[PDB]
Symmetry: D2
Subunit: 335 residues, 4 copies
C-alpha cells in the first residue's frame, strides 16, 4: 500500500477518493487538503448528485473525516508550502485544485515532503504528461516527479487516435466533443470571461474551446500539428462523446476502421479503450471505467474522410485513467 | 417621463430594463451601475436564455451601452457614494445588487443625488415594504423614500392571501413554493452555506428556507404570526407555484373559495392577481405580467383545511409588480 | 424458490425483476408476458437510463431471454386468458401492465394457472390493498388472492400518516406530492386525456390528480374522508416528495412531531419508514429501498397546522415495498 | 388570399399555422385535418411549451376552431381520400402528419381537391425537393405538384454547403448535427424501432441516423456521394447545430472560409442563411426565422480539413423555410 494525499476536494478529488475505495488494492488516501469545513466536505463526500451515496459510514471532527473507520487527516492550507505530507508518509499527491497546473507551483508538494505529484489536468512545465494505455511505458521513475494525467477529452481521443493512426495514418483531423456541462459554467446567464460559458448551462448547447485535440501531440508526438477541435457543452450532468473527423491516405471502409479498433481493444489496453457494437446512449457510459468507449455503430466514411465517435465519462472514466497512472507510479521507485 | 437608474445589472436589473422598455410609458432608464465591462453587460442584455433576444439594437463603448439609439450611461462604482445620479437627473434608483438590502446602506443613493430608492428584495430598516395591489395605497410620498418591493414569492402569496383572509379568514397557513432554480444555487455539487443549495440544481428537487410567507405580515399586518413555509427548488429555469394550505373557521367549498378569487380578480387589482380555469403548466406563465395567477383547478378542501395554488413568473411577474410600484412612486411628489 | 411471473415488462416490471435479483433469496422470476419483441425487451433490461447496466449477461431468442444463465420464458399475449402460468409453475404473477387494475380482469391470471395476483397500482374490486409496514398483517392467505400494492405516493404517505395520526390525531390533511415525471406524460406538447400531462414533461411543472391521499383510507380506515391532494410533476426522472399539511387537536411542536417518527422508524417498520436529519435532495433518495424517508428538517408547525415532508423513489422505493408484500405472500400458503 | 389546409396538426403543423399568422399577408389557413378532438387541438394551439401563448382568442366546436374570429374547418379523416379540400377552396395542403411522405400516397389530397401538396419532410417519389434559397428557382408550376420541403437539417446544411462548394470545392464531408430531442423519442426507457431513441430523451445524448447529408444531393446534385453524417439528440427542447467537416483541394484559411459566407449571406438569400460573429448558444436561435445561422467563431482549418458550424431552430427555422416555399408556390399558377 502506497499512501496518497489529495489537494483539492472538488469533483475530481472526490471522484478519485471513491475510485481508490472501489478499485484499488495498492493505494490508500490518508490525507486531504481543502479550504472548507469538515461538515461540508464530509456531506459532499457522502452524498453525490452523480454517483449516489457513498456506501461507507462517514463521520468528521475538526481535524479529520473518518470513512468506514479509516481516519483521513484534513488540512486547509491555501499554500502547499504550509503542508506536511511526510508527517503522514504520503508518497504521492494528486493535485486536483485547478490552481497548481503549473508544475513550478505544484513542486511545493515535494518540498512539503511528497515524492511525486500527479496533476489531474493539462499542466505546464511538467516532467511529463501521460494518457494511460498510450504512452505510460515512457514513465521514468527517477526523473518524472511532477507529471500530468492530461484532460478527460485527451484521454478519450488519444487511445482511439493511436490505434487509427497506427493502422491507417491520420493526415489531419478535427474534433467536436459533445460534452456534459461542467462546474466552470453558469447556472443562470451571468458574467464569465467566456461569453458563451456565461449562458445558463442546463438549457443551452454551449460552444467552447478546448486544447484537448492539440494536446494529443504530447503523448503521440507523431500527431503534432495534425489535430484540433472544440466542445459543445450540452444538458447532461456527466457523460460525453468525442467525434473525430479525419483525412487518411489509406483506402478505408466503415468495416475496416471498426475491425482495427476491435483488434486493438483487448488485454490491458482494452481497460483503457473499449469496442462496442451496443445501442449506447450517454447514461450507459456513466461510471464506465474506460477512458474511451468506441462506438462502432457511428463510424462513417466518405472517400478518404473518416468520422469516428468514442464515449467517455468525463468524470469517472478520466478518474479511472488517473488511478491507473497512480498505480503505475506507486509500483516503481519512490526515490 | 421620470428618469430611472439601476444599481446591479443582474437578472432582476436586466428584467427591469426590459420591462420598462416593453411596458412603461412614463419611465426611462438612463443610467446603470455595475462591476463589469460594457461588452459583457451589453451581450447579456442583448441575448437571454429565458427572455430571448432583445428586439432593439445594442451597441456599447467604454462609457455607455446604447439601446435602440438611446444612450445609457454605465458606471462601475462598488460603493454608491462614488455615484452621481443627479448628474443624469435620475429621480428613482432600483437597488437590485442584492448587497444593499439594508436601507441604511441603500440610502447612499439619495446622498448620491437620487430622491427615491426601491429595493428589489426583502429589505431591512426600510421606510416601507409594498406588494403592489395589496398595500400600495399606503405609500406616503413625503416619508417613504427608501422602500422595498418585497420578494417574488410574497408578491404571489399576498394578493391571494388578502382575498381569502378578507372573505373567509385564515387562522394559520403553511406554504410550499415549488420554485424555478435561481442563481444562488450550484450547477454541480459544491460548497454552499446551505448544504442543500450546494447540490446540482438542474437534476435535483432542492428544499430551502424562505421568509416570504412570514413577510406577508409586513403588507397584511392582520396575518402576522399566522403564515410560514419553505421552497422546493426544481429543474425549470423560471416559473414557480405557491401552494398554501390553511385552516379557516368558515365553512367553505372548492366552489366558494374559487368564486371569491374570481370576484376579486378584476379591474386594476386583476393586473396583480389573475383567476384562471385553464389547464396551466409552468411554461404557460413564463413572461406573465401578473404577480399571482390563481389556479382554480387545484383548489382542495377537507373539513376546515384549504389548499390553494397560485402561479408566478418569479422573474417577470415579480418585475412587473416592481414596475407598477415604480410607476406609483414616479407619479407622486419627488420632493 | 417460489416462482414469479411478470405481466407488463415496463418501468415497474423491470424494476421488480432487478429488485428480485438484488434483494431476494426466495423468489425467482421464470416467465414474463409483454407486448414487445425479445430484442427490444432484452436491450431495455440490459441498459437502464436510471438504474445503469444490469450486472449480468443477457441473451434472447424467439421464446425467451436468458439472464446470467437462467432462462426466462417470454410470451406476448394481449389477453391474459391466453396465458398458461401453470406451464412454468409460477405461483405469483405481478400485474404491472397498467391496464388490468380491475381485479375482475386481473383474475384471468388465476384461471390461467396463478395462485396469486399482485397489482402494482391502485386497483378496483380487489380482495385487499396493502402498504407493507402499515396493514400487511391483515393479509389473509385463503381469501386475499388478487391484491393491490397501492401507489408509490400511498406507500410514502400512509406510513408517516399512521404514526402521526396514532400519536396526535389528524383532523384533516391536504397533500401535494412533488413528483418525477412518468412514462405516460408527453415529451413534446401532444394529445393526452389529461390536458396538462399533454405538456412537454421535461420543461414543465405539470399539475395532475392523484388518488393517493384518498387511497390511504383503504389501508388506514381511521383516515377515511380526512385526506385529499394532488401532484406536481417536475423535471427529474425519478425521486419524489410528499408534502402533507394537516391540522390536529393536540399540542405539537417541531421537536415532538419529529420525535414521534424517530421512535417508530426502527425494526422492520424502519425498512418501510426511515427517519432522516440529513441535508437531502432528490438524487439522495434515488435507489433508496424505503417506501418513505421522513425529512425531519422540513417539519413546520403553525398553531394547530402541521406540515411534514417525506421522500420516495417512486420507482425503486415502491418496487421494494411491492417486493416486501410479495415475499410475505410467498411465505404463506399458495393453494390452488 | 391563397387558401391553405394543413394535414397533421402536430409540432410542425402548429408552427406552420403560427408562422402564417405572424409572417404572411397572402396565405390563410382555412381548414385542418388531424386525428384529435377539437378541445385538445384548440388547447395545444392556444398554449405552447416552446412558443408561449397564441396572442389570439381560440374557441372550438364539433366542426371547427375559431382563431381571432376566423373559422377554421376541422376534420379527422385517417385516410386523405375521404377529405374534400375543394369544399373550402383550399389550393395548397401542407402534408405534416409524417405518414404520407410517399408522394404516391400524398397525391390523394389532389384527388380530394388540392392543387398542390407540400410535404414537410424528406419524401419518396416526389415531383421535386426544395431548400428555399438553394434551388427554389427550379420550381415548375405545371409539373411540380407534390413536392418536399426536405428536412430541418437539410435546410441548415444545404445553404452553407452551396456557398463553400461553389467557392472552394468540397471533396467529401461528414456531418454531425447536435439536435434537440423530437416528439418520437421516448420520455422514459420504452419501445422504439430505433433502440437508442427508445432511451429517455431528456437525460441522454442519443445518437441516431439522419438522411440529411445525403438528401443535400437532391438539391445540390454536384454534391452527390460526397456527404454523409448522423445526429446526436441532446436535452434541449428546440435549437440545433450542424457541424460539417470537409476536405477541399483549395487553400483556405479561417478568414477565407468565413468571408465566403459573409459575402453570400445578404439579400433574399440572407433570409435563408445568416452570418454571425455573435457569442451564440442554442437559446439565441430559438424562434430565429433563418434556415441556417453560420457561426463564424466556430470555423476551424487544419491543412486541407475544414470544420464549419451552423445553427437552426429545427421547429421555427424549418417552418419559416417551408413558408418561404409555400409563398413561392402560391405566387404562381394554381391550376386544376
Ligand atoms: N469533467 C471534469 O470534471 C474534468 C475532466 C477532466 C479534467 N478535469 C480537471 O480536474 C481538475 C479539477 O476539476 P473539478 O471539476 O474537480 O473542479 P472543482 O469541483 O471546482 O474542484 C476544485 C476544488 O479545488 C479546491 N481548491 C481551490 N483552490 C484551493 C486551494 N488553494 N487549496 C485547496 N483546495 C483548493 C476547491 O475547494 P472550494 O470549492 O472549497 O474552493 C474545489 O473544491 C481541473 O484542473 C479540471 O480541468 C475535470
Ligand atoms: N427569481 C429571482 O431572480 C428573484 C425573485 C425575487 C426577488 N429577487 C431579488 O432580486 C435581487 C437580484 O437578484 P438576481 O436574481 O438579479 O441576482 P444576480 O443575477 O446575481 O444579480 C445581482 C447583480 O448585482 C451585481 N452587483 C453585486 N454587487 C455589486 C456592486 N457592489 N455594485 C454593482 N453591482 C453589483 C452583480 O454584478 P456581477 O455579476 O458583475 O458581480 C450581479 O450581476 C436579489 O436581492 C434577489 O433576492 C430575485
Ligand atoms: N413511478 C412509477 O413508474 C410508478 C410508481 C408506482 C406505481 N406504478 C404503477 O405501475 C404500473 C406500471 O407502470 P410503469 O411506470 O411501469 O408503466 P410502463 O413503463 O408503461 O409499464 C407498462 C408495461 O406493460 C406493458 N403492457 C401494456 N399492456 C400490455 C398487455 N395488454 N399485455 C402485455 N404487456 C402489456 C407495456 O409494454 P409496452 O412498453 O410494449 O407498451 C409496458 O412494458 C402502472 O399501473 C402504474 O400506476 C408506477
Ligand atoms: N424538429 C421537428 O419537429 C421537425 C423538423 C423538420 C421536419 N419535421 C417533419 O415534420 C413532420 C411532422 O413532424 P412533427 O415534429 O410535427 O410530429 P408530430 O408532432 O407528431 O406531428 C404529426 C401530427 O400528425 C397527426 N397525424 C398523424 N397521422 C395522421 C393521420 N393519418 N391523419 C391525420 N392526422 C394525423 C398527429 O396527430 P396526433 O398528435 O393525434 O397523432 C400529429 O398532430 C415529420 O415528417 C417530421 O420529419 C419535423
Amino acid at each position: 500500500t502506497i499512501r496518497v494525499g489529495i489537494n483539492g476536494f472538488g469533483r475530481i478529488g472526490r471522484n478519485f477518493f471513491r475510485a481508490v475505495l472501489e478499485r484499488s488494492d495498492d493505494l490508500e488516501v490518508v490525507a486531504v487538503n481543502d479550504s472548507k469545513d469538515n461538515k461540508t466536505l464530509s456531506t459532499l463526500l457522502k452524498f453525490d448528485s452523480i454517483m449516489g451515496r457513498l456506501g461507507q459510514e462517514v463521520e468528521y471532527d475538526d481535524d479529520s473525516i473518518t470513512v468506514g473507520g479509516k481516519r483521513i487527516a484534513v488540512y486547509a492550507e491555501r499554500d502547499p508550502k504550509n503542508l506536511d505530507w511526510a508527517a503522514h508518509n504520503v508518497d504521492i499527491v494528486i493535485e486536483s485544485t485547478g490552481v497548481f497546473t503549473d508544475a513550478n507551483a505544484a513542486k511545493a508538494h515535494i518540498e512539503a515532503g511528497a515524492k511525486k505529484v500527479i496533476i489531474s489536468a493539462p499542466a505546464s512545465n511538467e516532467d511529463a504528461t501521460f494518457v494511460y494505455g498510450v504512452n505510460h511505458e515512457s514513465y521514468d521513475p527517477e526523473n518524472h516527479n511532477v507529471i500530468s494525467g492530461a484532460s478527460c477529452t485527451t484521454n478519450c481521443l488519444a487511445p482511439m487516435a493511436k490505434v487509427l493512426n497506427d493502422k491507417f495514418g491520420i493526415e489531419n483531423g478535427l474534433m467536436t466533443t459533445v460534452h456534459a456541462y461542467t462546474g466552470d459554467q453558469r447556472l443562470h446567464d451571468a458574467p464569465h470571461r467566456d461569453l458563451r460559458r456565461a449562458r445558463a448551462a442546463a438549457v443551452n448547447i454551449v460552444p467552447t474551446s478546448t486544447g484537448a485535440a492539440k494536446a494529443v501531440a504530447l503523448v503521440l508526438p507523431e500527431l503534432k500539428g495534425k489535430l484540433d477541435g472544440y466542445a459543445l457543452r450540452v444538458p447532461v450532468i456527466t457523460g460525453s462523446a468525442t467525434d473525430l473527423t479525419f483525412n487518411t491516405k489509406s483506402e478505408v471502409t466503415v468495416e475496416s476502421i471498426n475491425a482495427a479498433i476491435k483488434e486493438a481493444a483487448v488485454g490491458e489496453f482494452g481497460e483503457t479503450l473499449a469496442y462496442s457494437e451496443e445501442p449506447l446512449v450517454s447514461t450507459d457510459i456513466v461510471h464506465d471505467s474506460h477512458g474511451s468507449i468506441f462506438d462502432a455503430g457511428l463510424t462513417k466514411v466518405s472517400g478518404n474522410t473518416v468520422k469516428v465517435v468514442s464515449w467517455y465519462d468525463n468524470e469517472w472514466g478520466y478518474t479511472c485513467q488517473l488511478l491507473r497512472l497512480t498505480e503505475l507510479v506507486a509500483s516503481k521507485l519512490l526515490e
